[PDB]
Amino acid sequence: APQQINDIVHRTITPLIEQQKIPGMAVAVIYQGKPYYFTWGYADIAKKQPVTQQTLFELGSVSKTFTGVLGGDAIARGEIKLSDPTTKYWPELTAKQWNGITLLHLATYTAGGLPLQVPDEVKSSSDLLRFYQNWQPAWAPGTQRLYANSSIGLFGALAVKPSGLSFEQAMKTRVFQPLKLNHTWINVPSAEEKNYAWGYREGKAVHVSPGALDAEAYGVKSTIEDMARWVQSNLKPLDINEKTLQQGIQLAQSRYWQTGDMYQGLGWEMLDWPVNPDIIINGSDNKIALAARPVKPITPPTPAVRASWVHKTGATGGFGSYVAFIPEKELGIVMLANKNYPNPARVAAAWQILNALQ
């Protein structure tokens, strides 16, 4: 098998890299619960530093899966409930449109049309309150899914408030450290900058800029080894000894809403396996992924289904990442690249590889 894995990966990824002009890439395949690593190209082109298994990539919105699991862990500690009103955790949010908007709604993009980004002009805490106080919803809570950093970003910031920890402290102590993710960072330390790839965008070497709620929505950087361990932990939560973290991983894969063939978890998105690859490939194009779509609630939320395709795309200006896994098959893939290339190309490649190995 390890050479069959090698050949399916090289047959699929090597043309992808040439077609998309990807400067550097790391891939981890989880096959029967074990990781196999592959690297291509350069972490820093100007310096000709190749990608290795310790290169840090920006995860972009794959960070939402960490936020979802951290929120699930808070649920399992009894610190929050997803049915709780947002205003329970932010009493200054007095404006009337927030009546009935819950943590569930924020976590799952169903608050009623919160926008894709927090505006750049939002810098201070008072800016952020004014932004949400003045937001006018386009839909009633719990009726339309509209993917939004301003939604799940706020979920993450509020979910950690009963703990008394900052979002970064909560994430480090409750998720990163129990799972031994020792090269995963919301802020890369000075000592670790040496491993931090440059992102590349139309001839420019770039790193993600600070923004409001960035840690919660798109701010994690990680290595291909830590992301393989993240997939392992999400594939087999019963191997995790911290009970509320085990339960939080499970809660993040519960099915809270359905739209089309897709189910919204906490951060993670899920479809039944085997999946029609046209559905996930086309559905990752921004024409669908960024569109408003009607949702139906699932009641009670379906406990994490083993025969699922569980996945998340992520981008920053200079990076493109993708994670997919199938709990029933103990099978998954991470793809990290320092160019933001179109999602359907990532999904089709990842599906080609896991399909071959099922």
Per-residue DSSP letter, 225: H
Alpha carbon of 119 to those of 29, 131, 213, 253, 289: distances in Å?
Answer: 37, 8, 11, 30, 20
Q: Give φ, ψ of 201 to 5 degrees.
A: -150, 110
- The active-site residue out of 61, 150, 222, 233 is 61
Gap between the Cα atoms of 246 and 229, Å rounded: 14
Task: Verify whether residue 61 is a known catalytic residue.
Answer: yes
Burial grade of 216 (CB within 10 A; 0-12, 13-18, 19 or more): buried
Alpha carbon of 126 to those of 93, 212, 243: distances in Å?
Answer: 11, 12, 37
Q: Give φ, ψ of 242 to 5 degrees.
A: -70, 110
At residue 227, the 3 state secondary structure works out as helix
Mode of pairing for the β-strands spanning 204-206 and 34-44: unpaired
| Closest listed residue to residue 215, CA positions, set 149, 313, 161 | 149
Phi-psi region of 112 (alpha: psi -120 to 50; beta: other; left: phi over 0): left
Question: CB within 8 A of 190, min separation 6: which ones?
Answer: none
The CATH topology of domain 1-358 is Beta-lactamase (3.40.710)
Total Cβ atoms within 10 A of residue 183: 20
Question: CB within 8 A of 48, min separation 6: which ones?
Answer: 42
User: Which H or E run includes 221?
Assistant: strand 221-222
| Closest listed residue to residue 299, CA positions, set 258, 267, 339, 337 | 258
Question: CB within 8 A of 133, min separation 6: which ones?
Answer: 93, 94, 95
Alpha carbon of 343 to those of 247, 276, 312, 340: distances in Å?
Answer: 30, 16, 10, 8
Residue 356 and residue 326 in contact, taking contact as beta carbons nearer than 8 Å = no
Whether the CA torsion 90, 96, 102, 108 is positive or negative: it is negative
Task: Count helices and strands (H / E) in the chain.
Answer: 13, 16
Q: Give φ, ψ of 244 to 5 degrees.
A: -75, -25
